[PDB]
Amino acid sequence: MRDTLVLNAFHMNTVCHMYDGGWRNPADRQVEFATLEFWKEVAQTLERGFFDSLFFADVMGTDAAYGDSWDIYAEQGIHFPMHDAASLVAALIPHTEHLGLTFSSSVIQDHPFSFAKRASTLDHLSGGRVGWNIVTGGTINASQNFGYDSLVPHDERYAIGEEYMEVVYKLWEGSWDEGALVADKTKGIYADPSKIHKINHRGERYRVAGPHLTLPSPQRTPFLFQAGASTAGRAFASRHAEATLVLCLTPDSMRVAYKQMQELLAAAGRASDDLLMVQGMSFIVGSTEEEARRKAEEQDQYLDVDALAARVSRDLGVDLSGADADQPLDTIQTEATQGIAKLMMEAVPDGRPKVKDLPLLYSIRIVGTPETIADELTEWRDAGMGGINMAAQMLPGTDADFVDYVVPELQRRGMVQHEYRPGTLREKVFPGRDRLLNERHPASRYRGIFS
Amino acid sequence: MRDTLVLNAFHMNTVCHMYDGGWRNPADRQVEFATLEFWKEVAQTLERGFFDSLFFADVMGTDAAYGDSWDIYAEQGIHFPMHDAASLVAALIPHTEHLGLTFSSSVIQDHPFSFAKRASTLDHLSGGRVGWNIVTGGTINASQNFGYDSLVPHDERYAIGEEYMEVVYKLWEGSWDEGALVADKTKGIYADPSKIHKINHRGERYRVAGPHLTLPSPQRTPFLFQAGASTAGRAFASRHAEATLVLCLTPDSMRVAYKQMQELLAAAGRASDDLLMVQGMSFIVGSTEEEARRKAEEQDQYLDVDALAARVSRDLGVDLSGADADQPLDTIQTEATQGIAKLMMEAVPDGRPKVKDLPLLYSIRIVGTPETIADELTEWRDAGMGGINMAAQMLPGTDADFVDYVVPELQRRGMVQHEYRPGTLREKVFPGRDRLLNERHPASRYRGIFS
């Protein structure tokens, strides 16, 4: 029973998250990412615009394309350098009040007992505003930073994923029962040892005695995001996610992905409203259509085709070292770019996708006036979009313009909330509910088991 | 050279760090430890009294070492619950300006590439105020929380200790060279790939490719503390530490530990002034001897001697349940419990070390007036004490009193600094020096080795 869209800012603790070459724009200030002040400015603007959450993506490595020099990753800041997402989230707790603060953490980078302790602590310190995006994947280099020959294969990836979630739910939901905090000074009982338990977790990958070291936090289990794109990904998302970060190319493609996710939720034994679909988007906005277009052209000069080529060439295998920007994708001869040009045909103004349209794989950009952007967003919501995952082409500019121009329009039409509701991030996203996960959710099954 | 004593507040993210049972004092507020607000009050008071840093110790397990029942650890909140130290440090960044922020992290809890990226981030985010206490040890439960049948033997702890430091120094000091950040937009070169390198570390415990993901931070390598009390500990502290958290029972005894530590530094190829001895203390203070003595009596009502014994047991690996308050510690039959009766004998007024006297293992309490406390700190400082490691019997009370009464006295006699010096934590502690570690330190050896 949430009538408004969920607004999530999609950022990353780095100089150039989303529109490769974007740092070079004189107008942009992503070069300031290592400072707290820059991030403070962004978090406060998003709170001013009534955003439900700010999200920080993260990675644990950096990789060359196959047979390519690593050079251009350093020169263009292509997701490198990369600073810790969790630290920034924490240092942002006191610069914000109501804004959700979400981060990615991978299976590989933190043992689930460690991570469970950290997340619990940030949930306490924040007042129940933490979210967690679960990463099972990784890149060759990230494997090699934690001493591993090569990638953990696709099957095992998600199975490891599952055990990890089983371990953190046992800790967050099972280890301390309701009523464990007593804190009676006169009677001399701080916590009730009859209600606190080891978890004695034993599985293929993890052995973990417990108990969990923290007091139950306001949410216990943080707000769960997941960006599974693949088959196993979508299934995992249906099992565990409260919001899934998706990348549909069109409203019709959202309707399909929506409908499919409803099937998987039913298989999971969850309700149709238990998971929001949150679509990747970015925005350029103006009082007239001519102003918006002109802002777009200014920013698009800083779109570095070779940096984008080096990001997409990693993510699709296929070498694209010499593609021109104005070159159509179908003019390139791979199975990857033949079927991605077919997909993109309807997402581009002219019906011919180009190398300069390849950012569409990562966020869908709408250019326009507040009214136009809102009408277009109305189509996406009616296709089953529950939320916006807003990436930036400039900081603080994309976020500032969106807040200053689009948010008021969306508010006027009742598509964005006018005030923050009281409660944890989970109670903000799912209005009538409890701070703890519903009984349909896997986590809920660890409640009570060790007593 | 620094003329003033260094001031470190010695806390932990938990309900009852020191003076077990102390949480029960109606006048105390440590039951509020899970909230950021309580820690905001404590950090701000310490900064108001010109403290060099605030330190959070941390643990990764809880152990039933007091016999059949674990019960007492929960009922008395004996280093349980335990919340994450680095999260708290980070969310205090914005509530403080000049105060150093220090935390313990263990070898076991975080792979050293992952930890390297977090410290680096917090160092950027704090402006070079970050410190790190290196923990190599732990407890049976902590091992079992990370899937290990039992402890690693004392020998191995420090060898693992060494490889971990080696790994983080390669990342912090080796991986990016002196002009790697270019960030010229006109020219379009963010970082210089010829100046950034993999580390390709390979040893007994760790295989880490690298490179380090972060920009070089103000200090690069955080401010290093270490509390190795044993032979291998003191040695490791001598190779690595900038302050060593020690526990001498008297001024004569400090002089001996200082003199010993000077030899170890010479053997390390370091300098006599490269490492401060930071002594563990606590304070009850009043305008008359009689006020201070009354404060002591009021607080000591809440000193729970069973809880204390239960903590010593965990720290030592010995059961002390069958030991009543007045049993001499030498009549208990262990190397642990007879080693610390030998040590404790000059500080106990009656001469025969007993279990009633066990708070002495963790800090020395001076009770008195500002003038008395200062006279007596003067004796310790002439024995070679470089800093005070201050624990709390009450929060905010012990820190509040120390600031309001002792600090101004200490300032008047030139023993505590009047203002903060500008710069990174390392530059505050070692006045004439650089933000980066001196050429005599092991970390410097990794500058340039991968160009």
Minimal Cβ distance to B209: which of A144, A185, A190: A144
Give the experimental resolution in Å: 2.5
Distance of CA A294 to the CA centre of its chain: 30
Pairing, β A130-135 against β A223-226: parallel
CA-derived radius of gyration, chain B: 22
Q: Is A3 exposed, middle or buried (0-12, 13-18, 19+ CB in 10 A)?
A: exposed
Give the closest residue to B415 by CA, choosing from B373, B450, B447, B444. Answer: B373
Say how far residue A355 (Cα) sits from the centre of its chain: 25
**In degrees rounded to 5, what are phi and psi of residue B112?**
-75, -20
Distance CA B16, CA B303 (A): 11
Residue A170 vs residues A163, B99, B194: alpha-carbon distances, Å: 11, 38, 47
**What single letter denotes the amino acid at residue B226?**
Q
Residue of B nearest to A95 (CA): B94
The residues in B 19-38 lying below 8 A from A, measured between CB atoms, are 21, 23-26, 31, 34-36
Nearest to A91 among B24, B91, B141 (CB): B91
Per the DSSP assignment, residues forming a β-bridge with B388 are: B7, B279
* B379 φ, ψ (degrees, to nearest 5): -65, -45
d(CA B224, CA A315): 40
Q: Do B144 and A208 touch (CB under 8 A)?
A: yes
Q: Is A237 annotated as a binding residue?
A: no
CB B169 within 8 A of CB A8: no
Distance CA B397, CA B115 (A): 34
Q: Which residues contact A339 (CB under 8 A, 6 or more apart)?
A: none
Query: Is residue B236 a contact partner of residue B158, using CB atoms and an 8 Å limit?
Result: yes
Assigned token pair, A190: 């701080």
**Nearest to B54, CA basis, from B392, B434, B374:** B392
For residues A280 and A260, is the Cβ–Cβ distance under 8 A? no
Instruction: Report d(CA B26, CA A292) in Å as an integer.
Output: 62
C-alpha to C-alpha distance for A257 and A255, rounded to whole angstroms: 6
Cβ atoms within 10 Å, residue A139: 17
Give B73's contacts in chain A (Cβ within 8 Å).
193
Residues of A in Cβ contact (< 8 Å) with B190: 15-16, 23, 31, 74-77
Q: A58 among the known binding-site residues?
A: yes
Residue to mutate among A36, A69, A84, A149, with most B CBs inside 10 A, is A84
Chain CA centroid to CA B163, Å: 21
Work out whether the CA dihedral A7, A13, A15, A17 comes out positive or negative. negative
Q: How far is A52 from chain B (nearest CA, A)?
A: 20
Is A66 in CB contact (< 8 Å) with chain B? no
Peptide bond connecting A26 to the previous residue in cis, omega within 30 degrees of 0: no
A131 bridge partner residues: A102, A223
| N-terminal to C-terminal alpha carbon distance within chain A | 34
Q: How far is B123 from chain A (nearest CA, A)?
A: 10
User: How many CB atoms neighbour CB B373 within 10 A?
Assistant: 22
Query: By C-alpha distance, which of B323, B294, B292 is closest to B308?
Result: B323
> Could you tell me how many residues make up chain B?
451
Closest residue of A to B80, CA-based? A213
Between chains, do A62 and B13 touch, taking CB under 8 Å as contact? no
Which residue in A91, A120, A124 is closest to B90 by CB distance?
Answer: A91
Q: Which residues of A touch B60 (CB under 8 A)?
A: 113-114, 117, 213
Q: Would you tell me the crossing angle of helices A154-169 and A231-240 to the nearest 10 degrees?
A: 10
Nearest CA in chain A to B215: A81
Please report, in angstroms and rounded to a whole number, the separation of the first and last CA atoms in chain B.
Answer: 34
Using alpha carbons, select from B312, B78, B33, B21 the residue that is nearest to residue A196.
B78
d(CA B101, CA B121): 13
- Cα distances from A332 to residues A314, A348, B383, in angstroms, run 17, 18, 77
Residue A330: count of CB within 10 angstroms of its CB: 17
Of A308, A307, A325, nearest in space to A361 by CA: A308
> Which residue ranges of B are tagged as binding site for FMN?
58, 104, 158, 227, 229-230
Minimal CA separation from A203 to chain B, in Å: 10
Kindly give the pairing relationship between strand A387-390 and strand B223-226.
unpaired
Over the range B32-49, which residues count as b (16 or more CB within 10 Å of their CB) and which as e?
bbbebebbbbbbbbbbeb
Residues of B in contact with A150 (CB under 8 A): none
Residues 131-150 (A) with a CB less than 8 A from some CB of B: 141, 144-148
Instruction: Please list every residue in chain A whose beta carbon sits closer than 8 Å to the beta carbon of residue B90.
Output: 87, 90-91
Residue A241 CB partners (closer than 8 Å, separation 6+)? A224, A225, A226, A228, A275
CB B202 within 8 A of CB B170: no
Measure the CA–CA gap between B107 and A194, rounded to whole angstroms. 31
* Cβ atoms of B108 and B143 closer than 8 Å: yes
- The structure tokens listed for B86 are 């680095």
**β-bridge mates for residue B133, sequence order:** B104, B225
Q: Which CATH architecture has domain B1-451?
A: Alpha-Beta Barrel (3.20)
Q: Judge whether B106 and A111 are in contact, CB under 8 Å.
A: no
The Cα A281–Cα A298 span in angstroms is 19
SS3 of chain B:
CCCCCEEEEEEECECCCCCCCHHHCCCCCHHHCCCHHHHHHHHHHHHHCCCCEEEEECCCCCCCCCCCCCHHHHHCCCCCCECCHHHHHHHHCCCCCCCEEEEEEECCCCCHHHHHHHHHHHHHHHCCCEEEEEECCCCHHHHHHCCCCCCCCHHHHHHHHHHHHHHHHHHHHHCECCCCEEEECCCCEEECHHHECCCCEECCCCEECCCCCCCCCCCCCCEEEECCCCHHHHHHHHHHCCEEEECCCCHHHHHHHHHHHHHHHHHCCCCCCCCEEEEEEEEEECCCHHHHHHHHHHHHCCCCHHHHHHHHHHHHCCCCCCCCCCCEHHHCCCHHHHHHHHHCCCCCCCCCCEHHHHHHHCCEEEEECHHHHHHHHHHHHHCCEEEEEECCCCCCHHHHHHHHHHHHHHHHCCCCCCCCCCCCHHHHHCCCCCCCCCCCCHHHHHCCCCC
Burial annotation A94-124 (CB, 10 A radius, 16+ → b, else e):
bbbebbbbbbbbbbbbbbbbbbbbbbbbbbb
Closest CA to B194 of B172, B179, B216: B179
**Residue in A closest to B77 by C-alpha:** A190
Task: Locate B277 and state its tokens.
Answer: 């001895």
- Which has the closest alpha carbon to B92: B152, B159, B5, B9? B9
Alpha-carbon torsion, ordered A71, A75, A76, A79, to 10 deg:
70
Is A87 in Cβ contact with B118 (below 8 Å)?
Answer: yes
- Asked if B146 and A118 come within 8 Å (Cβ–Cβ), the reply is no
Q: Left if phi > 0, otherwise alpha if psi is -120 to 50, otherwise beta: which for A333?
A: beta
All residues of chain B having their beta carbon less than 8 Å from the beta carbon of residue A113 are 60, 145-146
Cβ proximity of A317 and A394 under 8 Å: no
Provide Rg for chain A, Cα atoms: 22
Contact between A139 and A61 (Cβ < 8 Å) = yes
CB proximity under 8 Å: A 89-128 to B: 90-91, 93-95, 109-111, 113-114, 117-118, 120-122, 124-125
Asked whether the beta carbons of residue B36 and residue A94 sit closer than 8 angstroms, the reply is: yes
Q: What angle do CA A218, A85, B216 make, to 5 degrees?
A: 145
Q: Which of A74, A86, A114 sits opposite B191 (nearest CB)?
A: A74
A94-97 CB contacts, 8 Å cutoff, 24+ apart: A94/B36, A94/B40, A94/B91, A94/B94, A94/B95, A95/A40, A95/A43, A95/A44, A95/B94, A96/A43, A96/A44, A96/A47, A97/A47
- CB–CB contacts below 8 A, A to B: 217
Look at chain A and count its residues: 451
User: Closest-CA residue in chain B for A205?
Assistant: B147
Query: Which residues in A lie closer than 8 A to residue B25 (C-beta atoms)?
Result: 185
Instruction: Note whether A369 and A260 are within 8 A (CB).
Output: no
Structure-block tokens of residue A133: 């995006």
- Full 3-state SS string of chain A: CCCCCEEEEEEECECCCCCCCHHHCCCCCHHHCCCHHHHHHHHHHHHHCCCCEEEEECCCCCCCCCCCCCHHHHHCCCCCCECCHHHHHHHHHHHCCCCEEEEEEECCCCCHHHHHHHHHHHHHHHCCCEEEEEECCCCHHHHHHCCCCCCCCHHHHHHHHHHHHHHHHHHHHHCECCCCEEEECCCCEEECHHHECCCCEECCCCEECCCCCCCCCCCCCCEEEECCCCHHHHHHHHHHCCEEEECCCCHHHHHHHHHHHHHHHHHHCCCCCCCEEEEEEEEEECCCHHHHHHHHHHHHCCCCHHHHHHHHHHHHCCCCCCCCCCCEHHHCCCHHHHHHHHHHHHHCCCCCCEHHHHHHHCCEEEEECHHHHHHHHHHHHHCCCCEEEECCCCCCHHHHHHHHHHHHHHHHCCCCCCCCCCCCHHHHHCCCCCCCCCCCCHHHHCCCCCC
Q: After which residues is chain A broken (C to N over 2.5 A)?
A: none
> CB of A304 within 8 Å of any CB in chain B?
yes
Pair of tokens at residue A120: 């619990």
Residue A415, min C-alpha distance to chain B (Å)? 33
CB-based contact B214 A113, cutoff 8 Å = no
Answer yes or no: do B214 and A81 touch at CB < 8 A.
yes
Alpha carbon A374 to its chain's center: 22
| Six-digit token string for B344 | 């404790």
- Measured between beta carbons, the chain A residues lying within 8 angstroms of B117 are 60, 82-84
| Beta pairing partners, A12 | A57
| In chain A, domain spans | 1-451
Both tokens assigned to B402: 């120390």
Contact B308, B315 (CB under 8 A): no
Angle subtended at Cα B80 by Cα B76 and Cα B81, rounded to the nearest 5 degrees: 115
What are the φ/ψ torsions at residue A176 (nearest 5 degrees)? Answer: -110, 120
Q: Which of B227, B211, B105, B106 is nearest to B167 (CA)?
A: B211
Instruction: List CB contacts of A408: < 8 A, sequence separation 6 or more.
Output: A370
CB atoms within 10 A of CB A399: 25
* Annotated binding residues of B: 58, 104, 158, 227, 229-230
Q: Is A70 on the interface with B (CB under 8 A)?
A: yes
Distance CA A175, CA B312 (A): 25
Structure tokens given for A159: 């199975």
Q: Say whether residue B266 is in contact with chain A using an 8 A CB cutoff.
A: no
Q: Compute the distance between CA of residue A310 and CA of residue A295 in angstroms, rounded to an integer.
A: 25
Cβ(B46)–Cβ(B399) under 8 Å? yes
Give the burial string for B379-411 (b: 16+ CB within 10 Å, else e). Answer: ebbebbbbbbbbbbbbbbbbbbbbbebbbebbe
- CB under 8 Å to B87, separation ≥6 — which residues? A86, A90, A118, A121, A122, A125
User: Which are the residues after which chain B is interrupted (C to N > 2.5 Å)?
Assistant: none
Which residues contact residue A375 at a Cβ distance below 8 angstroms, ignoring those fewer than 6 apart?
none
B214 CB neighbours in chain A (<8 A) are 34, 81-84
**Separation between Cα atoms, residue B264 and residue B241, nearest integer Å:** 12
- Identify the experimental approach: X-ray
Hey, of B132, B145, B151, which one would you mutate to test binding to chain A, going by the most A CBs within 10 A of its CB? B145
The Cα A49–Cα A401 span in angstroms is 10
With b meaning 16 or more CB within 10 Å and e meaning fewer, what string describes A156-178?
ebbbbbbbbbbbbbbbbbbbbbe
The answer to whether A208 faces chain B, any CB pair under 8 Å, is yes
Residue type present at position B349 = P
In chain A, residues with a C-beta closer than 8 Å to the C-beta of B144 are 207-209
Instruction: Compute CA distances B102 → A163, B8, B11, B99, whole Å.
Output: 33, 9, 10, 10
Say whether B75 and A189 touch across the interface (CB within 8 A): yes
